[PDB]
Every structure is written in C-alpha cells, then in structure tokens.
Design a protein around this ligand. Sequence first.
Ligand SMILES: CNc1nccc(OC)n1
Ligand SMILES: [Cl-]
Ligand SMILES: [Mg+2]
Ligand SMILES: [Mg+2]
Ligand SMILES: [Mg+2]
Ligand SMILES: [Mg+2]
Lengths: 194, 194
Amino acid sequence: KQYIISEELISEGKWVKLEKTTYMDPTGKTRTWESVKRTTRKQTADGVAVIPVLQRTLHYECIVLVKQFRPPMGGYCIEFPAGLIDDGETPEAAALRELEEETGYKGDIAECSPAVCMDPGLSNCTIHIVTVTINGDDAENARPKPKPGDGEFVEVISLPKNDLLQRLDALVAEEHLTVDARVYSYALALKHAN
Amino acid sequence: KQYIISEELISEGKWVKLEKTTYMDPTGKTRTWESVKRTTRKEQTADGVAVIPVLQRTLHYECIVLVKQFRPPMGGYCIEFPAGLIDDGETPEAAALRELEEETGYKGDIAECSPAVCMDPGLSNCTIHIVTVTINGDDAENARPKPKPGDGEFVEVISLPKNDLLQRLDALVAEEHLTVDARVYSYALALKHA
Ligand SMILES: CNc1nccc(OC)n1
Ligand SMILES: [Cl-]
Ligand SMILES: [Mg+2]
Ligand SMILES: [Mg+2]
Ligand SMILES: [Mg+2]
Ligand SMILES: [Mg+2]
C-alpha cells in the first residue's frame, strides 16, 4: 500500500547524506520524510554487530563489549563490537574480523541474523547481528591482542551474561557512559526470559 | 581523554541536521566526524522512547506486542517496538504509555525505565528510554483494543509469544518483504540465549 515515489538529495558528505523522501501514504496522499543514509553501502547491510559470548570453564559466561568515544554522542558509549562490512566480505567474516580488531578475541560463528534496521524512522542503516562464541580456554584467547585500525581507540569490557542488565545500569550510574540500545535490549531480555 | 572541540552545522531540515564534528583523539590529535542529530530535542533526557510491551493473560503464554509500519528511510515495512518521540515536558514513562496506547490500543502499566540509551552512536546522537510495560490482557479496557494513531500514522499490531519470539520473527521475515528492528532482534536473541 505505501511506497517511495522519489528521493531528493539535500546534502552529501563523505560518510553521510540527508535526503528528502517522497512517499505515498495509505490514503493515497503524497507525503515527505527527512531520511539519512550512509554513503558507504555496496552489501547485505551497512555493518555487523557481534554478540561475543566469552566461555571459560569454571567462570560465568561473559558478554564481551567495547567502550569508545563516539563523536556524534559527544561522549563514551558501551556497545557490541561492530563495524562496516568490506565490499565483497561476508557478514560472518566481517564479524570475526571486527571482533579480533576491537577485542583481540578469536571466535566461532553460532548464528547470523538477517539484515536488521538501526533506527528506521531516521535512516536506512542496517546490520547483521552475529552471535559468536569465544573459547576463552584456548591459547589464542589467552592474551587477546587487539589490532585496531587507524583512529580507533577501543577499551574492552567483559560482563557476566547472567547479571548483564544490573552491571550495565551500574556503569551508567557510576561512569556516566551511554549504553547502546541493542546491548540494553539484549540485557533486558536475559532478565525477562521465563 | 577524548572530547568535542566544535560542531559546525552543514545542513538543517525541519526534523534532522547534519554536523561536522571536531574532536580530540587520545593521541592529542584533532579529528573530524560527520554527525546526525534531530532538531526536535529540547530538555528531554532522550529523543524518544521504545516500549517493550509484555501482554499478560490468564492461561496464555506472555506475548511481546510489536508494530509494523512503513518507514520512508527504509523504503519498506519494519517490525519494531512501539515507539515515539517524547513531547516537551513529558516524562519518558508517560510518553511510553501514551505511544503504546496510540499505536496499539493497549493500556499498559509501567514496569521499568532504562537510562537514555544510544540508537546508532557512530552516526547520530539519538537516544531513547526503553520502557518495559506490562499489559493486563484480562482487563476489559484491553479486550478489543483499537490503535488511535496520530496524523500520518498507519500502524499494524503483531503480538508474538515471548517463548518463541525469534522463530516467529524469522517466520515473518521468510513470508514477506520487511525488516526487523535491531533492538527487537537483539531482545529475541537473548530470550533464546537465556
Ligand atoms: C557517520 N559519520 C562518519 N563515519 C565515519 C567516519 C566519519 O568521519 C571521519 N564520520
Ligand atoms: Cl549463545
Ligand atoms: Mg567499530
Ligand atoms: Mg574497524
Ligand atoms: Mg511511533
Ligand atoms: Mg506514534
């Protein structure tokens, strides 16, 4: 019933553009929306976000997260390891690469989502969420060596899966960080299950 | 260590603006970013709310109530938590309960309210509160609920059992052209992983 009629470029940067979208509303009335897109999409999705489940025997399972300064936020954020997918890279491969660059951990693929939207009222940005387990008892994940790219500065924060939400709430109250909504959503469902 | 030095307006619409952000990297070097912001945020502790609406009914499995809408930035239909912007002076809880009623017809009861969490922190400063709400589906107010959607709002309600949410979402993605929201998907994954 609804669909896009046209897209007008308002402004194009190197990484981001703003467009004025005309669409037909379900009454047959024509309407406009201000829409953002990244200029980098080739791919199944713009990017991947990795849910990295650190498994060590006789320890709690942890979810491995990252903390970085995010210029659009004007502050530090706690997020799942994540990045853009390289032209002709698979989402799975992008997931293991990014996880290694940002954390130093080497993991195994458990499952991969379809493309999911980041903020669909604002942008067309999409990611695959890739669940990865990390055998924390293997020698290659003993002393994880992060190989981050140029101009990336990432701190790794591992938190127990079974207390994730309370641990996150504490980091916000204590460190004035912003937790990512996908991370928070995941944490909430862990408590809400059953 | 890191901080914002300046934010230069590139382009401002009615709803969204694009900014050139200058900030200090941790080596002590000046760098830039292209940042998106909404123009609608005033004193609110976030731009908006997303509601996690747990429909509870005697001798029924708990359902998560979701909405399906056309999203101009995406050029297609998306499945999301009920959600909207917080009106000036409105509390996040009030916004959540109001948007839930408007989008779904259901009258909820507040369970919990998250701190402000970031939508896509490498792109925008956009933030939400994630508000968990229970819906007493035995109450007569919630028997035959009707959306009371605003001007240019056109929403379908999809209630899925919490105990099978990921599979039911996957089934929906298999059968039509549409995109699941990344927060919805994250929540569904954790319900499996728990
Ligand atoms: C979405 N904006 C953006 N992405 C990547 C790099 C950058 O500036 C160097 N700006
Ligand atoms: Cl798992
Ligand atoms: Mg990254
Ligand atoms: Mg990277
Ligand atoms: Mg809405
Ligand atoms: Mg609404």
